[PDB]
Design a protein around this ligand. Structure first.
Ligand SMILES: [Cu+2]
Ligand SMILES: [Cu+2]
Ligand SMILES: [Cu+2]
Ligand SMILES: [Cu+2]
Ligand code: NA
Ligand code: NA
Lengths: 620, 620
């Protein structure tokens, strides 16, 4: 009966039924997005209304619709026709991805280009990629994908080893027309295979790894109730899943004595962008918004036990809609387990004679998704001591190109003739804060050095300063690692026993933000990625840092539009949006399949508790 | 028969015997430091000479000696009298620490101060702390400790809860005289206890934690031979232990095909400093050099199974000298185990139909030490993919003071009346590099942004630049997180299959460096801590960034003196010294015993291998 429960197969089929009955889901209609809406603010003793938001595409070229349905009540709440040239195209449909290669296979310009390179069309795979917004006026209001070619020598060959550089095509996936084929000239197609399961390349597999067995003989220490409500070591939360954002955490709270104390109302990765830094016209348009354009939840992997998730694992199998409104289960799509995390606290005291050691643990909630060549793991961790952490794990096969004769300032060499364009992977975590409730504020805290002199005659003193971010115009912040800059979210009306506002401190990794020129298309479409931290006043329609419709959508929506409202954020219902990312200059070690690399952030309690919250953890 | 084997009990008793026979270890002599010297460069087919370095203190006040002994040959190689006012005092002796409280207990000034505060002398513990170098001319050439008082209410009470502020004393631990007692006025002694094993404070212990069992049914995948030579998953190394540095790694190499490829010749934490940022004269002198002054290896804990180290653990029990030259074992002082480290690499490929997942693992070598109220864990990790990482874990009980009425810019409040002075914990990792051998160089690599314009018309291009550090004068570097700055150690004479020099990239955490005024005593004594990275030309006598004798030693030695030589480091035998640390503004959650906090660094292969080195890792 929780309003935060996962969508059921039945709810999705019911949305389908309601849309059908309403005349909104005839044979030419396709569901491009469907997700449950969160309950509105307040929603106390008010009866539940489970509502779903739906983006409906039309394959005949009619205008799409945004629709809200009450599945509880069997009604359409609202339905509005979208002008996609203005507000953006709907997310890419899985069915549209296949279209590109099929259409290109009988296009005379494409065939001419392949023949110039002596490539069999039957062996040429096309990566169908999001198009963005550049100088092509005819694309405005049209659903376009751009295709890059890769040769697959046999069915089990890794095509990524064989990029076909100097060639790109653009395709209208509704009218099913090839709008453009650009051939800037032949490059050698790299010849070495990248088949990481071929014994020829791996050599004999190691026989040196002895097993590691992780078990829980009495089961896990967390409980799951209502399908997705987790209780573990004082923590309480609900594990949601949305087709766009993937795993979303709701109602993160900590039971301190008798009181369930809220910390974060909603945590998600609300966008992720992968901008490429190769100025070649073959790839200079390439920017994946995996969340906004592709929908990362849609491509979540089914995770195998003893392989993707090790230990005593509890799975959730979230349900999503297919293109026709039928429910589809992602079996074992979400892993939940606890794991040991080394020493929590330790002191061997001479004077008392007491030696004390306690172990730490963390609760892990994760999923993994595959977007073409890339595979991303999203991990949320809750620790015994009140720390909350996110970590992204980036792996997959690197996106390749030719390596130019005489080198490149924007591409690295992986193998003979094989290049990897430089790129970033940049995430936006949207943290709808609720530190002891909704009345919150943000301070930027920097270390403050002090000069030797009166009051500091030994020149040893150092301090810090906190600056309250009072209004949204003042709340777009950059990192400063050199000064130890962090941001504290506190509740000015909730004081700890020492009469200080309770708080949590966000610790960033201080990785580089978006590197593109500030006047580029990508700097405008991914404006959030240009700054490390933004704070907005909560609003129900401000969900993504890039707005609702990212595909082929220019700037005009998202975070820059939200903060222009210049709203009060000093002791109000606020949302923190943290940008963090990896800057990747691919190395030879990343080829032919890349070892995981990571990036993330954490929040640690900062005068939230009246003393350590783990004094009651038992020995051994 | 390895020259890198741990010191045996027999070797230490033999050093004692040789010193005795030579007339260097009579009844007034004490061993303040004893350690094996590493073999000299070359030392190929030359027969081994196990040599030990010894600092010998004299309790009658005669000059100390530095002595080198050949235990293989039964000889004294050299013995020189030290002028400690010039070159520094010897490390603090464990026996000298007790002296402070005992002497103060019958000192009239101390007793007057305690009586003014109504404190029973029998209940007053004195933290005996290193003295440093300040304005007290009479301390020059003398062994001084400074004592700060803490009340212990009963034998099992945590005295740290009850600091006696406004009082400090200075003691000559050789002549056994109290040189000074400073009383700046009474402060309330905080009254709440900090007894983290008292049921009154912990409340009922949790019954919610179910067991986690980590086992290896066939044993571990690493082998130990010659006492301390480790082979694990292509890695090869020797695990040393020194009383000053603690765990030291030697001959870190990776077996790539048929060739054992060196990476790091010697890795250690060569210093650690804990400077305090409270300008009160009671503490403005407080700076622990735990490595240099106290000797962290000496205080290494005995680590209990299932408690300090979980899983299938292999222990080393290193042997050190006591003050008289007798061997003393630290039982179970070093933990060695492998552990699972999540996903190593993963890709689910549409086109090939191949879904591939592999697990990562790391080899862990650790120890834990206790220095008064603080407890530090030192962890080295080796990963399957060639990554090397260090992590320090800081825990213990925070060093306390009174919390001033009306607050403080330099102290935080933990409990009623109880303060915690701001401080840092700053480490120096000395990495004697050997990337494919000893001919190495360092480049600083920054990300390079590019302007939209000709050659970059979409404004998407980004790049990077590398600057070779050619001479020591150019090799004192600061972090720049905003530009993604890293440092690459490469071998200009060893190229991978793509004709690029093999390398390893150091990734720092970019935490703040030493905050003290640059004209302070601590900025001079801990000059290394003011910059993130230094590169020197290898020399056998350049072991510590603070020199051989840190106790009560001014600037004049260490890294600033080493680089003045302005030696060639462009394709030479070089040493990287990385400064990294935590800046601590204690929070209420740190009280009464602090949850672990961490800091570290890692090095990842950068064109070292000809492709991923983990293609031969087996499934599941
Ligand atoms: Cu092939
Ligand atoms: Cu990448
Ligand atoms: Cu007490
Ligand atoms: Cu600290
Ligand atoms: Na909020
Ligand atoms: Na070296």
């Amino acid at each position: 009966a929780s309003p935060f429960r996962l969508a059921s197969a039945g709810e999705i089929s019911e949305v389908q039924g309601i849309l059908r009955t309403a005349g909104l889901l005839g044979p030419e209609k396709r569901i491009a997005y469907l997700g449950v809406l969160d309950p509105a603010r307040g929603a106390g003793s008010e009866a539940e209304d489970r509502r779903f938001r739906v983006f409906i595409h039309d394959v005949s070229g009619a205008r799409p619709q945004e629709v809200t349905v009450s599945v509880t009540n069997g009604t359409v709440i609202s339905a509005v026709e979208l002008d996609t040239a203005a507000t953006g195209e709907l997310p890419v449909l899985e069915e549209e991805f296949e279209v590109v290669e099929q259409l290109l296979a009988t296009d005379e310009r494409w065939l001419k280009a392949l023949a110039a390179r002596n490539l069999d069309v039957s062996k040429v795979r096309v990566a169908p990629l999001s198009a963005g917004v550049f100088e092509y006026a005819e694309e405005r209001g049209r659903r376009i994908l751009r295709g890059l070619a890769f040769v697959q020598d046999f069915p089990e060959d890794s095509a990524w080893a064989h990029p076909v550089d100097g060639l790109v095509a653009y395709v209208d996936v509704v009218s099913k027309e090839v709008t453009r084929v650009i051939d800037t000239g032949v490059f050698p197609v790299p010849a070495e295979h990248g088949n990481y399961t071929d014994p020829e390349l791996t050599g004999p597999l190691r026989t040196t790894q002895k097993p590691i067995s992780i078990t829980q003989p009495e089961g896990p220490s967390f409980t799951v109730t209502g399908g997705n409500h987790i209780e573990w070591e004082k923590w309480s939360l609900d594990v949601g899943f949305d087709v766009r954002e993937g795993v979303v955490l709701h109602n993160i709270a900590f039971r301190d004595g008798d009181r369930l104390r809220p910390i974060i109302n909603r945590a998600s990765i609300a966008e992720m962008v992968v901008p490429y830094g190769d100025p070649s016209p073959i790839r200079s348009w390439q920017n994946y918004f995996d969340t906004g354009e592709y929908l990362v939840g849609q491509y979540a992997n089914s995770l195998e036990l003893g392989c993707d998730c090790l230990g005593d694992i509890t799975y959730l199998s979230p349900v999503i809609s297919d293109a026709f409104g039928n429910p589809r289960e992602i079996r074992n799509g979400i892993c939940m387990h606890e794991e040991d995390w080394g020493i929590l606290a330790k002191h061997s005291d001479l004077w008392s004679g007491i030696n004390y050691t306690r172990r730490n643990r963390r609760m892990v909630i994760s999923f993994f998704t595959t977007i073409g060549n890339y595979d991303y793991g999203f991990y949320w961790y809750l620790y015994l001591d009140g720390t909350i952490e996110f970590e992204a794990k980036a792996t997959g096969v690197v996106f390749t190109s030719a390596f130019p004769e005489g080198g490149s300032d924007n591409i690295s060499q992986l193998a003979p003739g094989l290049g990897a364009p430089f790129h970033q992977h940049i995430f936006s975590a949207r943290l709808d804060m609720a530190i002891d409730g909704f009345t919150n504020r943000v301070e930027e805290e920097d270390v403050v050095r002090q000069t030797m002199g009166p009051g500091n005659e030994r020149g040893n003193a150092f301090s810090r300063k906190r600056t309250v971010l009072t209004r949204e115009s003042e709340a777009v912040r950059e990192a400063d690692a050199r000064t130890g800059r962090t941001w504290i979210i506190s509740n000015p009306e909730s004081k700890n026993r020492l009469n200080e506002p309770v708080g949590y401190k966000l610790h960033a990794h201080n990785q580089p933000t978006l590197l593109a020129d500030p006047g580029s298309s990508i700097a405008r479409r991914a404006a959030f990625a240009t700054k490390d931290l933004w704070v907005t006043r909560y609003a129900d329609d401000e969900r993504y840092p890039t707005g609702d419709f990212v595909n082929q959508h220019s700037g005009g929506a998202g975070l820059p539009s939200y903060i222009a409202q210049d709203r009060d954020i000093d002791g109000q219902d606020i949302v923190v949006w943290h940008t963090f990312g990896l800057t990747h200059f691919p190395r030879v070690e990343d080829w032919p399949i890349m070892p995981v690399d990571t990036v993330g952030f954490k929040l640690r309690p900062e005068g939230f508790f009246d003393r350590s919250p783990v004094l009651d953890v038992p020995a051994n």
